[PDB]
Amino acid sequence: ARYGATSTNPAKSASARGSYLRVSFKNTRETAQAINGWELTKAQKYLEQVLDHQRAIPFRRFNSSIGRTAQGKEFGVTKARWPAKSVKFVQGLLQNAAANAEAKGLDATKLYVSHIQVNQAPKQRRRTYRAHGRINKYESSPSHIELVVTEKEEA
Amino acid sequence: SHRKYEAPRHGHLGFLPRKRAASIRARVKAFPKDDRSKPVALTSFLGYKAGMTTIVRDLDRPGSKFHKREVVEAVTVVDTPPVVVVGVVGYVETPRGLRSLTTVWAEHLSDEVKRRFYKNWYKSKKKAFTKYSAKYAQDGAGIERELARIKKYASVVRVLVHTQIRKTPLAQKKAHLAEIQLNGGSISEKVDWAREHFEKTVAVDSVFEQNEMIDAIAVTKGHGFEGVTHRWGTKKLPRKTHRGLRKVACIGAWHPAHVMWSVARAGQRGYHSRTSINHKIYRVGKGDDEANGATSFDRTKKTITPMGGFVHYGEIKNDFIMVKGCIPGNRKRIVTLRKSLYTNTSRKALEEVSLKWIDTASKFGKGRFQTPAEKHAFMGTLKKDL
RNA sequence: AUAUUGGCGAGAGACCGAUAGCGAACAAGUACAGUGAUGGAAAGAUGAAAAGAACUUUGAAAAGAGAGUGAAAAAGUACGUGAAAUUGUUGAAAGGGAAGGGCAUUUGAUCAGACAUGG
RNA sequence: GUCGAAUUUGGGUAUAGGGGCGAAAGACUAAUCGAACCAUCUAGUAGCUGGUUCCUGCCGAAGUUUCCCUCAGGAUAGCAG
RNA sequence: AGAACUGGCGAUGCGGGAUGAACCGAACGUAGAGUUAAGGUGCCGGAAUACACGCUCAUCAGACACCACAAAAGGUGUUAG
RNA sequence: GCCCUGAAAAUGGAUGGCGCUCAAGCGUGUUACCUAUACUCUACCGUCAGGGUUGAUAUGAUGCCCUGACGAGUAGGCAGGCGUGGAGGUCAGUGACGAAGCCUAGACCGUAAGGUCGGGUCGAACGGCCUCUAGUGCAGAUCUUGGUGGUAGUAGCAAAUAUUCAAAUGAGAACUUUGAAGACUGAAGUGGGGAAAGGUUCCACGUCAACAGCAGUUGGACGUGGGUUAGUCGAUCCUAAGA
RNA sequence: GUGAACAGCCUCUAGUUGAUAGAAUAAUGUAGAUAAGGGAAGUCGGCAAAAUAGAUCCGUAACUUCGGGAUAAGGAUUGGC
RNA sequence: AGAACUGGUACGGACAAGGGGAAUCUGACUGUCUAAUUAAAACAUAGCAUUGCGAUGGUCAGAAAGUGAUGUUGACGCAAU
RNA sequence: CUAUCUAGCGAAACCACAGCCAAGGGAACGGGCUUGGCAGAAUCAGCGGGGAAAGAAGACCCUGUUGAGCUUGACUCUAGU
RNA sequence: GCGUUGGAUUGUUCACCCACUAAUAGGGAACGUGAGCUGGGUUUAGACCGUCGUGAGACAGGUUAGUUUUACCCUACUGAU
RNA sequence: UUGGCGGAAAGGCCUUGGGUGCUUGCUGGCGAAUUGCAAUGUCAUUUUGCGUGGGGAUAAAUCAUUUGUAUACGACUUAGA
Ligand SMILES: [Mg+2]
Ligand SMILES: [Mg+2]
Ligand SMILES: [Mg+2]
Ligand SMILES: [Mg+2]
Ligand SMILES: [Mg+2]
Ligand SMILES: [Mg+2]
Ligand SMILES: [Mg+2]
Ligand SMILES: [Mg+2]
Ligand SMILES: [Mg+2]
Ligand SMILES: [Mg+2]
Ligand SMILES: [Mg+2]
Ligand SMILES: [Mg+2]
Ligand SMILES: [Mg+2]
Ligand SMILES: [Mg+2]
Ligand SMILES: [Mg+2]
Ligand SMILES: [Mg+2]
Ligand SMILES: [Mg+2]
Ligand SMILES: [Mg+2]
Ligand SMILES: [Mg+2]
Ligand SMILES: [Mg+2]
Ligand SMILES: [Mg+2]
Ligand SMILES: [Mg+2]
Ligand SMILES: [Mg+2]
Ligand SMILES: [Mg+2]
Ligand SMILES: [Mg+2]
Ligand SMILES: [Mg+2]
Ligand SMILES: [Mg+2]
Ligand SMILES: [Mg+2]
Ligand SMILES: [Mg+2]
Ligand SMILES: [Mg+2]
Ligand SMILES: [Mg+2]
Ligand SMILES: [Mg+2]
Ligand SMILES: [Mg+2]
Ligand SMILES: [Mg+2]
Ligand SMILES: [Mg+2]
Ligand SMILES: [Mg+2]
Ligand SMILES: [Mg+2]
Ligand SMILES: [Mg+2]
Ligand SMILES: [Mg+2]
Ligand SMILES: [Mg+2]
Ligand SMILES: [Mg+2]
Ligand SMILES: [Mg+2]
Ligand SMILES: [Mg+2]
Ligand SMILES: [Mg+2]
Ligand SMILES: [Mg+2]
Ligand SMILES: [Mg+2]
Ligand SMILES: [Mg+2]
Ligand SMILES: [Mg+2]
Ligand SMILES: [Mg+2]
Ligand SMILES: [Mg+2]
Ligand SMILES: [Mg+2]
Ligand SMILES: [Mg+2]
Ligand SMILES: [Mg+2]
Ligand SMILES: [Mg+2]
Ligand SMILES: [Mg+2]
Ligand SMILES: [Mg+2]
Ligand SMILES: [Mg+2]
Ligand SMILES: [Mg+2]
Ligand SMILES: [Mg+2]
Ligand SMILES: [Mg+2]
Ligand SMILES: [Mg+2]
Ligand SMILES: [Mg+2]
Ligand SMILES: [Mg+2]
Ligand SMILES: [Mg+2]
Ligand SMILES: [Mg+2]
Ligand SMILES: [Mg+2]
Ligand SMILES: [Mg+2]
Ligand SMILES: [Mg+2]
Ligand SMILES: [Mg+2]
Ligand SMILES: [Mg+2]
Ligand SMILES: [Mg+2]
Ligand SMILES: [Mg+2]
Ligand SMILES: [Mg+2]
Ligand SMILES: [Mg+2]
Ligand SMILES: [Mg+2]
Ligand SMILES: [Mg+2]
Ligand SMILES: [Mg+2]
Ligand SMILES: [Mg+2]
Ligand SMILES: [Mg+2]
Ligand SMILES: [Mg+2]
Ligand SMILES: [Mg+2]
Ligand SMILES: [Mg+2]
Ligand SMILES: [Mg+2]
Ligand SMILES: [Mg+2]
Ligand SMILES: [Mg+2]
Ligand SMILES: [Mg+2]
Ligand SMILES: [Mg+2]
Ligand SMILES: [Mg+2]
Ligand SMILES: [Mg+2]
Ligand SMILES: [Mg+2]
Ligand SMILES: [Mg+2]
Ligand SMILES: [Mg+2]
Ligand SMILES: [Mg+2]
Ligand SMILES: [Mg+2]
Ligand SMILES: [Mg+2]
Ligand SMILES: [Mg+2]
Ligand SMILES: [Mg+2]
Ligand SMILES: [Mg+2]
Ligand SMILES: [Mg+2]
Ligand SMILES: [Mg+2]
Ligand SMILES: [Mg+2]
Ligand SMILES: [Mg+2]
Ligand SMILES: [Mg+2]
Ligand SMILES: [Mg+2]
Ligand SMILES: [Mg+2]
Ligand SMILES: [Mg+2]
Ligand SMILES: [Mg+2]
Ligand SMILES: [Mg+2]
Ligand SMILES: [Mg+2]
Ligand SMILES: [Mg+2]
Ligand SMILES: [Mg+2]
Ligand SMILES: [Mg+2]
Ligand SMILES: [Mg+2]
Ligand SMILES: [Mg+2]
Ligand SMILES: [Mg+2]
Ligand SMILES: [Mg+2]
Ligand SMILES: [Mg+2]
Ligand SMILES: [Mg+2]
Ligand SMILES: [Mg+2]
Ligand SMILES: [Mg+2]
Ligand SMILES: [Mg+2]
Ligand SMILES: [Mg+2]
Ligand SMILES: [Mg+2]
Ligand SMILES: [Mg+2]
Ligand SMILES: [Mg+2]
Ligand SMILES: [Mg+2]
Ligand SMILES: [Mg+2]
């Protein structure tokens, strides 16, 4: 309860959250944006064949010095990747929304992801040992994910 | 400040940028000056580089230690099946340079050529020139009046020919298509000649001939990213130098405070377009012939293909040009052969050669035998056979 | 009669208000450091009341989504208010080797000051 | 390099800071040595470097004189309010 | 490098000198209309490709104070004396 | 006089640029034209000066009013004001019917310091005026404490020969367990015990939030338990350098 | 086992197979090798690298503190049966 | 130790394992040190020489002492260079 | 074996604002100013020209009425004798 | 426009010889060029001599030994989408 | 609608034969106001979405896989109904 800005009709839609998840914030962001606005099954099937390395996730912000792939051509892009742990968690959340959408009587076949939004959770903090008896931070940058599925409108 | 000693710079600034070509088919950037008084001519010719071998022949060079003596030279054999004309293109003079005005295509286009226009031939609906041919159907007009305008405009006429790549051992089924300038008289007589040669064949011996110097336009064998030492030639830095020694030490003076366009940096080597000139024709091969590799002296019935096939290429079953020395590009790669842009009286250029012997031993190893006939006529009988 | 930054019992202040006031408002001379002498922190606030979310559903679980408690969950033992840097999303805009500023107006957005006369 | 001794080394024991210990390098004396470490005197002193927090109105300088172990500083007069 | 009188810069923006502490003009509350200064008016650029008499042709012309240099020496170029 | 020679330097470049040859060059003359925060007139702000005016005559005598002149400013002096914590006095001041605080290319007032309001958020307090008082105003001090960026999903996670098939278990298996294969340490050991030191790490069962810089169902981790048996092994006795 | 051997190399008992992993094999590296002809011309300098090497049997200079110098140098040989 | 036979003349076949010679400067040698930029020609050393001292003493320690090192010593000794 | 590309994991230096040149002037070597050349998203691997790059409030030198280690017929003293 | 070299001694720039050659021109680019090398010289700390100094120490006098750090950022340059 | 001409970027030009609206070459019959004395009063052409009806056509590219004439990654080059 109490999500980011939304314009969806709450009645034709249900939602899902994940907080404090130990996935990469930068990376899940890049994949969340990737399915943002997709029809649920389209998005679901794509994320599934990202894992299979048949196509990729465009990296458009947190992306410098990333490799170039042939698989980015689809999205007019040279840098893409296949961030499994991100896909995985995001998959997880797409499920639960799909779950909640069905318990709500929303027609599975009219669901697109109307909202998907990862910002960053509190950092975990580990030590690394650097030369000349020094210590440095070695932090995890966890993610909050949230998303919403909605029924497409007759028009 | 003023280098302690002088040396000439490394590398040639006239072959920049040392980047990869933008077509594996090197561009003929120049054609010969037209003499519109001679018959209608092809100016260049397509072909596939097949490999090299050795030659023997008496040198005719009055005043040389080696005059009237036998020399042994290296040659390259380029696989040259007849090419086929499938159109003619018309170029008009402008104050902005030559301009293609129209192109007119033949009515029937071989599958090889058609393949060239596709990226995914196999799953295609092969609709390549299907509507274009219809222009022919209506008795003429359409085509008839485009040849008409190439005739009244157009300062230069090129033909569109394509290789019959399938005659080649090459696996590539897609063929090679190129414009070739016509150099016989009068625009009109040119497009006429092209019209009449639609779907028809043209062979080398109708363009080139023995003792003729020709130029070779091909794309250099690539090598990918190269360090500065081999790429530019650059001295090796001493053994003791930290952080590597296949470098150059002083990438620049303090001022200009910019690495300069003219110092050696690592990058691509190979896969460049080169126009190599003055390669003299030692043999024009006939495919029908079975004495391709034979000689007035060495009479034995053998073809040009070495024992075991040209390595990484196959057998020469077609016509071929055999040229003195080496030409740019590697085996399997398309070459354009252009006739010279000038009339060289070099005396070397004018020498008429007669081959005395063509090496036909295996190249896949330290070959010992010219013909399997000869092998067996020396080895004896083996455990196999008889 | 005089002294009194110690000890015990008290009454007070135009003192400080959790980076302040004693180092310590808290299991503070604690946790931790150092062979040792010594050094020495951080750390207060759900709600009147736990009424600390029965139950259902998704999940391997953590949790999510409903439901429920409450004046409030825009108070969920991460908990009063919850600023800034910095961040995700959405919306508008601009962008030929920085951005930002001054005077001026186009354009778009936005906001005004009315005051009262006969049926 | 040396490798059967002026050998290597465990534990115990002794020497403690203007002191030790030194086959001598100002070496070593707990990552500290041309004087260890700890706390206190101690908010040590600085003619030198750095910073010094709101608005508007009005007036508005000096780098020159004299003396100074004076020359990156003061006193004195001038200029200023 | 060091003195002399005055005016500046420093402490001062503004118009000119492309540029710039110190030159020229001119010193400053918020503004309107006018006129100017020094400097400019082919175009960049507001403002006569104005008027008038000469001079100059450079296979290294020349083009404005401070100021971004030039000399002894020489020419049957051309002009006037 | 103008022009020519005399006249040689280092990235490519400078009458400011373009470009200009009866000039857009040089010398001279004559007109017009453009333009400063300067000059002229006027409004308004302030400063200073000079006056007028409470005789009884609704609400400012330190006030009202008339007139003239003037306005650069560092270091610096002075004046008048803005704002904060706390104190005396007064508005019988605001407030759970919403105090304070915070958010707001919404509004108004002031040259300004600032002041006032609306909307959202909030939830127990808090203002104005006269006065008192000071631990009273930050952009800087390689300032103090804390918190956060770009760097960046980047540097990197490459010493120490080497792993592979299959089953089991599990939500999940490159990494756990069993089986097989391939290998290593090669007794100067990667074997079997100990001294110093640690202090439960030992063993069993359960078990993965954190930690083991991939992973984890495994662990020297987490939870809960269990375990160290002496006349003869040591200490204990003795003396050593020393204390 | 080899061997002079507690060297190196391979093995038995025991113990491990633990050091993120996958795909590629550009430049430049780090570590390991080779190079025709010449042979220190490289360089401050043979730095680095190369060459020699066990054993048996011959042979062995100046000098000398008579002990040495000396594996001086320089040669031949080496399996299996 | 010797002999025959045998081989693509190989055979310490992996492993293991000195390059040599002629000289100048310098320290005799073995040994020592700047832990973490100097291993050396520097320190040490045997050897040589000097100095002081017969105990109510030489050299040295302690604030002082019925205090202490040499000294469980005695000039073939101790101390100092 | 790296680098490289992938999954997971994931720091640090440094950071006025930043990042194309030529000339001019200028605190006498500009990323910014003046006049010109010019100038088109977003990017990957390399590189050592420049960022008068980064790393320490310059060890050099001077100044300071600032030291300390050491030496001496400096000044002034002192254990001892 | 195009070239301007191979060597002996020296850390050297310079110098000076041998030798080849068409010629072995002179200069700049932060006395171009150390996150490009090298570290021979110079100029920390060890050490020998000589001169100087009573001494501690000094000496563009001779001598020997003496740690050469970071790029992953921007730009530039090379190549690549 | 009949002929021609135009390729420098022709994308336009000349010409034939009618049809048809207008004709201010000329002579008539009406109409205009109150839009209140200017403001404010002809609408030009770009695109881009939809809408009617008429003619018309019925493909590839990328991912993946594959070649090695290519290659750090992308990219390149082949192949597959
Ligand atoms: Mg949350
Ligand atoms: Mg980023
Ligand atoms: Mg990288
Ligand atoms: Mg980058
Ligand atoms: Mg991209
Ligand atoms: Mg580390
Ligand atoms: Mg350590
Ligand atoms: Mg030169
Ligand atoms: Mg190379
Ligand atoms: Mg070559
Ligand atoms: Mg090195
Ligand atoms: Mg061959
Ligand atoms: Mg009490
Ligand atoms: Mg506190
Ligand atoms: Mg604070
Ligand atoms: Mg505290
Ligand atoms: Mg301490
Ligand atoms: Mg509270
Ligand atoms: Mg709190
Ligand atoms: Mg729950
Ligand atoms: Mg509330
Ligand atoms: Mg609350
Ligand atoms: Mg709870
Ligand atoms: Mg809260
Ligand atoms: Mg965020
Ligand atoms: Mg209105
Ligand atoms: Mg010393
Ligand atoms: Mg120490
Ligand atoms: Mg320490
Ligand atoms: Mg103080
Ligand atoms: Mg004044
Ligand atoms: Mg005076
Ligand atoms: Mg005095
Ligand atoms: Mg000063
Ligand atoms: Mg003046
Ligand atoms: Mg000053
Ligand atoms: Mg002025
Ligand atoms: Mg000027
Ligand atoms: Mg004047
Ligand atoms: Mg201009
Ligand atoms: Mg004008
Ligand atoms: Mg002339
Ligand atoms: Mg003058
Ligand atoms: Mg004259
Ligand atoms: Mg000259
Ligand atoms: Mg000039
Ligand atoms: Mg003149
Ligand atoms: Mg004039
Ligand atoms: Mg005049
Ligand atoms: Mg004039
Ligand atoms: Mg004015
Ligand atoms: Mg003023
Ligand atoms: Mg006040
Ligand atoms: Mg007030
Ligand atoms: Mg107050
Ligand atoms: Mg206070
Ligand atoms: Mg704001
Ligand atoms: Mg409120
Ligand atoms: Mg409350
Ligand atoms: Mg007051
Ligand atoms: Mg204060
Ligand atoms: Mg601050
Ligand atoms: Mg600051
Ligand atoms: Mg990551
Ligand atoms: Mg990486
Ligand atoms: Mg590493
Ligand atoms: Mg390993
Ligand atoms: Mg398996
Ligand atoms: Mg493994
Ligand atoms: Mg083994
Ligand atoms: Mg061993
Ligand atoms: Mg267990
Ligand atoms: Mg881990
Ligand atoms: Mg884990
Ligand atoms: Mg346990
Ligand atoms: Mg073990
Ligand atoms: Mg590791
Ligand atoms: Mg090998
Ligand atoms: Mg060789
Ligand atoms: Mg030799
Ligand atoms: Mg040399
Ligand atoms: Mg030499
Ligand atoms: Mg030397
Ligand atoms: Mg040397
Ligand atoms: Mg060596
Ligand atoms: Mg070798
Ligand atoms: Mg060899
Ligand atoms: Mg002897
Ligand atoms: Mg034998
Ligand atoms: Mg010598
Ligand atoms: Mg010695
Ligand atoms: Mg020795
Ligand atoms: Mg050392
Ligand atoms: Mg040594
Ligand atoms: Mg050493
Ligand atoms: Mg002697
Ligand atoms: Mg990665
Ligand atoms: Mg940076
Ligand atoms: Mg510049
Ligand atoms: Mg210049
Ligand atoms: Mg200029
Ligand atoms: Mg300069
Ligand atoms: Mg700069
Ligand atoms: Mg300016
Ligand atoms: Mg500019
Ligand atoms: Mg650089
Ligand atoms: Mg840097
Ligand atoms: Mg000194
Ligand atoms: Mg003084
Ligand atoms: Mg003094
Ligand atoms: Mg001193
Ligand atoms: Mg000292
Ligand atoms: Mg004395
Ligand atoms: Mg004396
Ligand atoms: Mg110079
Ligand atoms: Mg230099
Ligand atoms: Mg450099
Ligand atoms: Mg360096
Ligand atoms: Mg050096
Ligand atoms: Mg040196
Ligand atoms: Mg020294
Ligand atoms: Mg030396
Ligand atoms: Mg050494
Ligand atoms: Mg970096
Ligand atoms: Mg009509
Ligand atoms: Mg009007
Ligand atoms: Mg390959």
Swiss-Prot record, chain A:
GO cellular component, as recorded: cytoplasm; cytosol; cytosolic large ribosomal subunit; preribosome, large subunit precursor
Record PTM Phosphothreonine, positions in chain: 69
Statement: the UniProt record of this protein carries the keyword Transmembrane: no
Signal peptide positions on this chain: none
Protein localization: Cytoplasm
Alphabetized GO MF terms: structural constituent of ribosome
Keywords assigned: Cytoplasm, Isopeptide bond, Phosphoprotein, Ribonucleoprotein, Ribosomal protein, Ubl conjugation
Similarity comment text for this entry: Belongs to the universal ribosomal protein uL22 family.
Subunit structure: Component of the large ribosomal subunit (LSU). Mature yeast ribosomes consist of a small (40S) and a large (60S) subunit. The 40S small subunit contains 1 molecule of ribosomal RNA (18S rRNA) and 33 different proteins (encoded by 57 genes). The large 60S subunit contains 3 rRNA molecules (25S, 5.8S and 5S rRNA) and 46 different proteins (encoded by 81 genes). uL22 is associated with the polypeptide exit tunnel.
Protein name, entry field: Large ribosomal subunit protein uL22A
Annotated organism of origin: Saccharomyces cerevisiae (strain ATCC 204508 / S288c)
UniProt gene name: RPL17A
Swiss-Prot record, chain B:
Chain positions with Phosphothreonine modification: 102
GO cellular component, one term: cytosolic large ribosomal subunit
Effect of a null allele: A mutant confers resistance to trichodermin, a trichotecene toxin produced by plant-pathogenic fungi.
Phosphoserine: residues carrying this PTM: 23, 155, 296
Principal cellular location given in the protein's record: cytoplasm
Gene3D superfamilies per the UniProt record, alphabetical: 3.30.1430.10, Ribosomal protein L3, domain 3, Translation factors
Subcellular localization, as worded in the UniProt entry: Cytoplasm
Record PTM text: Methylation at His-242 by HPM1 is required for proper 60S subunit assembly and promotes translational elongation fidelity.
Domain of life: Eukaryota
Example GO molecular function: structural constituent of ribosome
Presence of the UniProt keyword Cytoplasm in the record: yes
Covalent cross-link Glycyl lysine isopeptide (Lys-Gly) (interchain with G-Cter in ubiquitin) as placed by the record, residue numbers: 38, 135
Further remarks about this protein from its record: Present with 450 molecules/cell in log phase SD medium.
Protein family: Belongs to the universal ribosomal protein uL3 family.
Name of the protein this chain belongs to: Large ribosomal subunit protein uL3
Organism, as annotated: Saccharomyces cerevisiae (strain ATCC 204508 / S288c)
